[PDB]
Design an enzyme around this catalytic site. Structure first.
Site, PDB file in Angstrom:
ATOM      1  N   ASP A 109      37.892  38.651  32.747  1.00 51.99           N
ATOM      2  CA  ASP A 109      37.615  39.368  33.966  1.00 51.99           C
ATOM      3  C   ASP A 109      38.906  39.877  34.622  1.00 51.99           C
ATOM      4  O   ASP A 109      39.012  39.977  35.858  1.00 51.99           O
ATOM      5  CB  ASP A 109      36.858  38.497  34.997  1.00 51.99           C
ATOM      6  CG  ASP A 109      36.302  39.261  36.181  1.00 51.99           C
ATOM      7  OD1 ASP A 109      35.986  40.449  36.125  1.00 51.99           O
ATOM      8  OD2 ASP A 109      36.099  38.561  37.265  1.00 51.99           O
ATOM      9  N   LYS A 144      40.794  45.673  32.617  1.00 59.43           N
ATOM     10  CA  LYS A 144      39.824  45.999  31.607  1.00 59.43           C
ATOM     11  C   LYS A 144      40.444  46.440  30.281  1.00 59.43           C
ATOM     12  O   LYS A 144      39.874  46.174  29.208  1.00 59.43           O
ATOM     13  CB  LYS A 144      38.788  46.944  32.100  1.00 59.43           C
ATOM     14  CG  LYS A 144      38.077  46.532  33.419  1.00 59.43           C
ATOM     15  CD  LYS A 144      37.695  45.052  33.489  1.00 59.43           C
ATOM     16  CE  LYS A 144      37.488  44.629  34.923  1.00 59.43           C
ATOM     17  NZ  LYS A 144      37.443  43.150  35.049  1.00 59.43           N
ATOM     18  N   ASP A 152      33.045  40.162  31.850  1.00 57.89           N
ATOM     19  CA  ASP A 152      32.527  40.866  32.976  1.00 57.89           C
ATOM     20  C   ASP A 152      32.768  42.403  32.863  1.00 57.89           C
ATOM     21  O   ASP A 152      33.727  42.798  32.183  1.00 57.89           O
ATOM     22  CB  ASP A 152      33.158  40.306  34.274  1.00 57.89           C
ATOM     23  CG  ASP A 152      32.435  40.778  35.539  1.00 57.89           C
ATOM     24  OD1 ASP A 152      31.208  41.081  35.490  1.00 57.89           O
ATOM     25  OD2 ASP A 152      33.088  40.897  36.674  1.00 57.89           O
ATOM     26  N   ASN A 153      31.986  43.210  33.578  1.00 60.25           N
ATOM     27  CA  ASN A 153      32.274  44.585  33.832  1.00 60.25           C
ATOM     28  C   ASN A 153      32.234  45.412  32.590  1.00 60.25           C
ATOM     29  O   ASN A 153      32.952  46.419  32.501  1.00 60.25           O
ATOM     30  CB  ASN A 153      33.639  44.702  34.455  1.00 60.25           C
ATOM     31  CG  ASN A 153      33.759  43.955  35.769  1.00 60.25           C
ATOM     32  OD1 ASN A 153      34.643  43.093  35.930  1.00 60.25           O
ATOM     33  ND2 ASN A 153      32.895  44.313  36.703  1.00 60.25           N
ATOM     34  N   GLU A 167      28.813  43.651  41.816  1.00 57.98           N
ATOM     35  CA  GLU A 167      28.956  42.846  43.049  1.00 57.98           C
ATOM     36  C   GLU A 167      29.052  43.727  44.350  1.00 57.98           C
ATOM     37  O   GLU A 167      29.701  44.763  44.353  1.00 57.98           O
ATOM     38  CB  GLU A 167      30.164  41.921  42.896  1.00 57.98           C
ATOM     39  CG  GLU A 167      31.517  42.676  42.677  1.00 57.98           C
ATOM     40  CD  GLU A 167      32.025  42.710  41.266  1.00 57.98           C
ATOM     41  OE1 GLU A 167      31.220  42.763  40.308  1.00 57.98           O
ATOM     42  OE2 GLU A 167      33.277  42.736  41.078  1.00 57.98           O
TER      43      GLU A 167
HETATM   44  O1  OZS Z   1      39.479  45.841  38.045  1.00 61.56           O
HETATM   45  C1  OZS Z   1      38.738  44.797  38.134  1.00 61.56           C
HETATM   46  N1  OZS Z   1      39.253  43.615  37.794  1.00 61.56           N
HETATM   47  C2  OZS Z   1      40.672  43.462  37.483  1.00 61.56           C
HETATM   48  C3  OZS Z   1      41.123  42.053  37.877  1.00 61.56           C
HETATM   49  C4  OZS Z   1      42.366  41.641  37.700  1.00 61.56           C
HETATM   50  C5  OZS Z   1      42.760  40.260  38.098  1.00 61.56           C
HETATM   51  O2  OZS Z   1      43.253  39.503  36.957  1.00 61.56           O
HETATM   52  C6  OZS Z   1      44.621  39.090  37.142  1.00 61.56           C
HETATM   53  N2  OZS Z   1      45.227  39.080  35.838  1.00 61.56           N
HETATM   54  C7  OZS Z   1      45.762  40.199  35.109  1.00 61.56           C
HETATM   55  N3  OZS Z   1      46.196  39.814  33.928  1.00 61.56           N
HETATM   56  C8  OZS Z   1      45.944  38.458  33.896  1.00 61.56           C
HETATM   57  C9  OZS Z   1      46.255  37.609  32.720  1.00 61.56           C
HETATM   58  F1  OZS Z   1      45.423  36.575  32.473  1.00 61.56           F
HETATM   59  F2  OZS Z   1      46.063  38.183  31.527  1.00 61.56           F
HETATM   60  F3  OZS Z   1      47.522  37.184  32.627  1.00 61.56           F
HETATM   61  C10 OZS Z   1      45.358  37.973  35.057  1.00 61.56           C
HETATM   62  C11 OZS Z   1      45.118  40.204  38.118  1.00 61.56           C
HETATM   63  O3  OZS Z   1      46.341  39.844  38.773  1.00 61.56           O
HETATM   64  C12 OZS Z   1      43.949  40.317  39.125  1.00 61.56           C
HETATM   65  O4  OZS Z   1      43.840  39.202  39.991  1.00 61.56           O
HETATM   66  C13 OZS Z   1      37.318  44.936  38.613  1.00 61.56           C
HETATM   67  C14 OZS Z   1      36.978  46.123  39.230  1.00 61.56           C
HETATM   68  C15 OZS Z   1      35.662  46.249  39.733  1.00 61.56           C
HETATM   69  N4  OZS Z   1      35.272  47.481  40.363  1.00 61.56           N
HETATM   70  O5  OZS Z   1      34.128  47.719  40.671  1.00 61.56           O
HETATM   71  O6  OZS Z   1      36.160  48.290  40.556  1.00 61.56           O
HETATM   72  C16 OZS Z   1      34.694  45.208  39.569  1.00 61.56           C
HETATM   73  C17 OZS Z   1      35.112  44.042  38.993  1.00 61.56           C
HETATM   74  O7  OZS Z   1      34.190  43.031  38.841  1.00 61.56           O
HETATM   75  C18 OZS Z   1      36.415  43.840  38.469  1.00 61.56           C
HETATM   76  O8  OZS Z   1      36.703  42.719  37.819  1.00 61.56           O
HETATM   77 MG    MG Z   2      34.918  41.606  37.385  1.00 60.42          MG
END
Ligand code: OZS
Ligand code: MG
EC number: 2.1.1.6
Length: 213
Positions: free
Chosen positions: A139, A142, A167-168, A197
């Site tokens: 999650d 993407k 997810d997504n 959501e």
């Molecule tokens: O972009 C979305 N999610 C991106 C979420 C990203 C999250 O994952 C962390 N991360 C990145 N790399 C790692 C790791 F582990 F690799 F190091 C961890 C990022 O800092 C952030 O907190 C999103 C967007 C929508 N939307 O409707 O736009 C709906 C959703 O449910 C979503 O999840």
């Molecule tokens: Mg998500």
């Protein structure tokens, strides 16, 4: 003051300490009523709960902690001794997630990994005493679902029957990952349809009656 800090403070002020369900409900209320945020939400969350319960994983990896909503959701369903590892590259998010878990009383079950997956995935077995993963929740960004799945495989972290749950896959979409797993004989895939959501989006009309020059 950030949105994520506002969400944490809302929880600390409204939710019941040591009550994971309360924490989830507070997050959902705040994001429904006050500010949209990318938590998986209750609709998809119920599906996650049903999958976790089915498989009863002993060791889960989450990629993408954000505010810790899914970490609270998953950790509350783990059996005694089972572990959740959650990866968060943003240190502000990692701190919020730890506080959310602490508030919920779930800190003993969860280990936050602050770092990039390209660094951390290859260190999992040696630094965090892992053999193979029972389940992986994807999650994060993407475009990272597919390269990270491939890295997990490279590093020997997947076994026959490891459950990946992503997810997504519709919105925003993960099209390379989805095509890959659906086309590969190395994966057996099932789709669970639900809803994005917090999508009761307010808009309005303005009426402006001209009064003359
Ligand atoms: O972009 C979305 N999610 C991106 C979420 C990203 C999250 O994952 C962390 N991360 C990145 N790399 C790692 C790791 F582990 F690799 F190091 C961890 C990022 O800092 C952030 O907190 C999103 C967007 C929508 N939307 O409707 O736009 C709906 C959703 O449910 C979503 O999840
Ligand atoms: Mg998500």
């Amino acid at each position: 003051d950030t949105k994520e800090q506002r969400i944490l403070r809302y929880v600390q002020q409204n939710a019941k300490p040591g009550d994971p369900q309360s924490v989830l409900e507070a997050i959902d209320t705040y994001c429904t009523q006050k500010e949209w945020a990318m938590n998986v939400g209750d609709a998809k969350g119920q599906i996650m709960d049903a999958v976790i319960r089915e498989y009863s994983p002993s060791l889960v990896l989450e990629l993408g902690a954000y505010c810790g909503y899914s970490a609270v959701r998953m950790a509350r369903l783990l059996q005694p001794g089972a572990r959740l590892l959650t990866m968060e590259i943003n240190p502000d998010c990692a701190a919020i997630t730890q506080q959310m878990l602490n508030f919920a009383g779930l800190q003993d079950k969860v280990t936050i990994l602050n770092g990039a997956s390209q660094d951390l995935i290859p260190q999992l077995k040696k630094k965090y005493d892992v053999d193979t993963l029972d389940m992986v929740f994807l999650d994060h960004w993407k475009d990272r679902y597919l390269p990270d799945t491939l890295l997990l495989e490279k590093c020997g972290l997947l076994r026959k029957g490891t459950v990946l749950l992503a997810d997504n896959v519709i919105v925003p979409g993960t099209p390379d990952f989805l095509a890959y797993v659906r086309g590969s004989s190395s994966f057996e895939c099932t789709h669970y349809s639900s809803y994005l959501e917090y999508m009761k989006v307010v808009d309005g009309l303005e009426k402006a009656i001209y009064q003359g020059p």
